[PDB]
Design a protein around this ligand. Sequence first.
Ligand code: MSS
Ligand code: MSS
Lengths: 343, 345
Amino acid sequence: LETKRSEFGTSIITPEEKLYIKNNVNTPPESILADRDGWKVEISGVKEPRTLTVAELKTLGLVTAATVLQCSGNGRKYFKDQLTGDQKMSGTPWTVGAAGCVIWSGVPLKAVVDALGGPAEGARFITGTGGEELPAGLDPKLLVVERSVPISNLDNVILAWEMNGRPLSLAHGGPLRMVVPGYSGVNNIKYVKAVAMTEVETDAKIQKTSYRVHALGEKGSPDQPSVWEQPVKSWITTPHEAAKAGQVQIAGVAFGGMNACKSVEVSVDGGQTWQEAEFIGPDLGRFAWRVFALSADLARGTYTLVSRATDTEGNVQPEETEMNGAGYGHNGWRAPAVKLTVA
Amino acid sequence: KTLETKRSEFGTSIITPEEKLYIKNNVNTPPESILADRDGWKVEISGVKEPRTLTVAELKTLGLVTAATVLQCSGNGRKYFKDQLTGDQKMSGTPWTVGAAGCVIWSGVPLKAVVDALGGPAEGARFITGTGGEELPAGLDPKLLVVERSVPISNLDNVILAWEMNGRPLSLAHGGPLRMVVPGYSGVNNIKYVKAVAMTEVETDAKIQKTSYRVHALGEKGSPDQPSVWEQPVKSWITTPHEAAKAGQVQIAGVAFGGMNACKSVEVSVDGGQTWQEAEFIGPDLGRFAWRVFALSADLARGTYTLVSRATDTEGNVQPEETEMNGAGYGHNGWRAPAVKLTVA
Ligand code: MSS
Ligand code: MSS
């Protein structure tokens, strides 16, 4: 399920009912939400390992933060567009609609691990396991949705039970989700049933070989970069198609992943000339996105609207993103251009 | 048809979900068909150098602004005034506790941009006067029923003509297709389905401005020499937990705002205001007109606690224990009355 450009709005926050849905496996039954507070999470790799219920988690702390939830596959269509000859690429051909900015609320993982005496000596990763039932007999490593991120993320990770002021839906990973701000969608583990502080990455297929950045025709392997930190990115959201001659408000969303978006330039002529856009609305912090807008006075014609964001570390979107075989992490400014017909 | 939000339904994400947001109308709602063609909705702009009627489509060309505000009825907390009546004293109106309030993100065009595009306000303009889009009964005195409100023109730079709330087109319940939003001002001033915005030399003399929504003593009539319900005062309340908890660690949370000013700090007491501790803010700061979530991490023995919060704004205005009585029961902001009784077992 992919969001259309008109549906992002300009309120920063993406409506929960329009937020994209992506699952690697079939979803659990909705009955896991019957008793949200009774959902159990096994916490290990800490000094005092224990299973805690969501009711217990709710006693330990409270944190609220906005992040950009974006599939590593967002923009895959734009990689497929660059294929030539016999070159092939499988996977969902997302354009820009596998992304939203949402507000999570829950308990800091740091508060949970501290209540259990802190991480075990030598821990280097946070490893979260999805709560889906695995089919009996088969090697669960082949199907389990289990991801590892560096333990440097500990102070930012949230075990969230709420999003945009509502209890977390099944579609978005209720009753509890491991949120890793600034990291690609796959790392944000839905219906999280275990969190382990580990010395090594999980060897689950979804970590070891899937979700790796490699050349076309190469297999994924664990020496290659995983889809972890999200790169600087933006796109135009409005007007998504049309306007009338004269003043037009051009707007979109921009983010720096782990870093704040510092500035955004907008072009109406496919990147031949650029102008600085203004940020619109409140700043929800470095892991969220900003709305930006440029006022332009346009004659009747067909414009090519593009946006180019820079983060606080000086990372800037390229015109086109280097190819990788599975089509992860697109952040180019040319491919997501909006054709604006001005009447 | 009113809808009051339950304490359990505010959440701790700052933003109040649209489907939980309270509903209050002074008259019947217009039909759903006014949303069929949102972009064709017309707004008459007057009291400017070049007056004209603009459609929502035209308004959308002139600017873009996004801002969070606390939308709260002047009547929120009226129950707490009714609880203080003695003897023969009476007070009509909806007995809201704390649920006639939410924090929402609006998006639309700044009224300043609209006014600037039409050559600025006419010399001598003193008020911004918005007229609701409801149909009025034919041949009856429209002043008696029209939802028309005037606020000082000092609000010009803050006012938004909003077509969107919380990332979606504004619903009928919350004043689509276009709403005049007056940040920091009481709910009544945030005119739904706004069909006219006038920069006027005087307040409207519509009943709902002249004599309703005035602050007066019990047994007095409303009159235009009295303060109108305009700026909303510093306020907070506890939202969670709402009834029971287990002994041990308890996260006590709520919402706090300063109205025209940001909330700077919040104190929380678990013993009915005898002892206070400073709470922490939770989540991002959505600006001076929004509310903050706050929380206190408490460690509680078995017993019956009385949870209260006391907010201070950036200018040193602090909530009183009790709010001075007024006859229509507007603007309650006391910390004692909205206490949560928490049974810890
Ligand atoms: N448990 C789990 N979790 C999980 C999953 C699954 O399947 N399971 N998926 C992923 C992905 S992959 Mo690609 O990188 S994007 C993504 C995300 C999505 O989310 P939403 O649906 O809520 O939107 O999630 C995440 N998480
Ligand atoms: N047009 C119009 N608007 C309007 C109206 C009516 O009736 N009409 N109401 C008021 C009031 S009053 Mo007392 O101060 S509160 C209030 C508000 C509400 O909102 P929601 O329903 O959305 O919540 O609105 C406002 N606006």
